[PDB]
Amino acid sequence: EDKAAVERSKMIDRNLREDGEKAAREVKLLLLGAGESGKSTIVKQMKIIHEAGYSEEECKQYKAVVYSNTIQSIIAIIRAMGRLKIDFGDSARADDARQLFVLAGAAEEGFMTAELAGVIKRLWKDSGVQACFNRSREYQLNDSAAYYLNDLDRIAQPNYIPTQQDVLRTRVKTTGIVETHFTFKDLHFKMFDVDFEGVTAIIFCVALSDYDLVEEMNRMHESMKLFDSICNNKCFTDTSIILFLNKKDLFEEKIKKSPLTICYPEYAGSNTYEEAAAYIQCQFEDLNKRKDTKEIYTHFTCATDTKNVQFVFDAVTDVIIKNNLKDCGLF
Ligand SMILES: Nc1nc2c(ncn2[C@@H]2O[C@H](COP(=O)(O)OP(=O)(O)O)[C@@H](O)[C@H]2O)c(=O)[nH]1
Numbered sequence: 001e002d003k004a005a006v007e008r009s010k011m012i013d014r015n016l017r018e019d020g021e022k023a024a025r026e027v028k029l030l031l032l033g034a035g036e037s038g039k040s041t042i043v044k045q046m047k048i049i050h051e052a053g054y055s056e057e058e059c060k061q062y063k064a065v066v067y068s069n070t071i072q073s074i075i076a077i078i079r080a081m082g083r084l085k086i087d088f089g090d091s092a093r094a095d096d097a098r099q100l101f102v103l104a105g106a107a108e109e110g111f112m113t114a115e116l117a118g119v120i121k122r123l124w125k126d127s128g129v130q131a132c133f134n135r136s137r138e139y140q141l142n143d144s145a146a147y148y149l150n151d152l153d154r155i156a157q158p159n160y161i162p163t164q165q166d167v168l169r170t171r172v173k174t175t176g177i178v179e180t181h182f183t184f185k186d187l188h189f190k191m192f193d194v195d196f197e198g199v200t201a202i203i204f205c206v207a208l209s210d211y212d213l214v215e216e217m218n219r220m221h222e223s224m225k226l227f228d229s230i231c232n233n234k235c236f237t238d239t240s241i242i243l244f245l246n247k248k249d250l251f252e253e254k255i256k257k258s259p260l261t262i263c264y265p266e267y268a269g270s271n272t273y274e275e276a277a278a279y280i281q282c283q284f285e286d287l288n289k290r291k292d293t294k295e296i297y298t299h300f301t302c303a304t305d306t307k308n309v310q311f312v313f314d315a316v317t318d319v320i321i322k323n324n325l326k327d328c329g330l331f
Pocket residue numbers: 033034035036037038039040041042143144168169170171172205246247248249250301302303304305
């Protein structure tokens with residue numbers, strides 16, 4: 001954005017400070033959205049992209065988290081089979097299912113051995129297990145279940161070291177409000193992941209692939225309600241409201257087989273990625289009560305995709321530079 005460079009070059013407030021050219025222009029960014037919408041993943045991406053990121057030794061720290069998530073995923077599927085009354089493809093997998101629970105049951109924390117890897121591999125290749133997997137909207141299953149289970153052989157190797165993508169795919173139970181700092185285009189970002197005064201911008205995350213998920217309340221509806229409060233809150237009048245319609249990769253896969261009408265019974269468009277995503281975007285943007293005063297800046301994201309997040313965050317920063325710089329202090 002040549003317009004961004006020009007816009008920021010119009011500022012003169014550094015001149016009022018003795019060492020103004022060395023001062024830090026600060027941007028305060030609130031990262032919001034329902035649980036599992038992708039907030040932590042965006043935080044990790046900011047570290048990877050703008051701060052070098054996740055070194056091998058750092059990645060190693062996530063090994064047992066990867067194991068934990070993998071064990072949780074397969075157990076979720078196996079348990080759901082009993083509830084949905086889905087039989088194993090090969091009755092022999094029943095012994096493996098039992099063994100899964102024996103091994104997870106006796107251990108202290110996530111782990112992986114050859115024996116466990118074999119049990120999980122055989123379960124995951126079984127046709128009943130796959131049929132239950134494909135009905136995951138009917139229970140609660142980690143988004144990254146397939147990612148880890150399909151790569152089990154690599155993850156189970158004795159000298160396994162998690163990759164960045166392995167780390168980005170983890171589900172980690174975070175609580176409270178976490179602040180991270182990073183500098184990009186010479187802006188000093190202060191990012192708060194809320195699981196606020198002077199907020200320059202809000203990035204609001206939505207899991208697109210929640211549309212067909214729940215117990216007796218639709219997860220997308222809840223995200224809408226939450227965006228509604230936020231977008232029209234008086235405190236955020238001058239705040240740039242950025243909307244990340246996230247998990248577009250998972251959404252693209254689901255929409256082929258699971259109709260949007262599950263979420264919006266009135267939807268009468270085609271069940272294609274293009275029409276259904278557009279419709280969701282319109283549903284969210286329509287919650288904006290001040291359409292003549294405030295614009296929503298919407299992006300379709302895959303938060304685990306570093307190149308996608310770098311591209312999007314670049315566009316978001318140019319919007320901030322063009323609209324909000326005058327409200328950003330020097331420190
Ligand atoms: N496939 C896919 N997985 C994602 C995406 N965004 C987040 N995830 C995964 O979804 C899970 C929940 O994301 P997380 O960042 O922890 O959500 P948070 O509760 O808002 O902090 C994690 O396992 C992430 O790796 C996405 O765009 N695509």
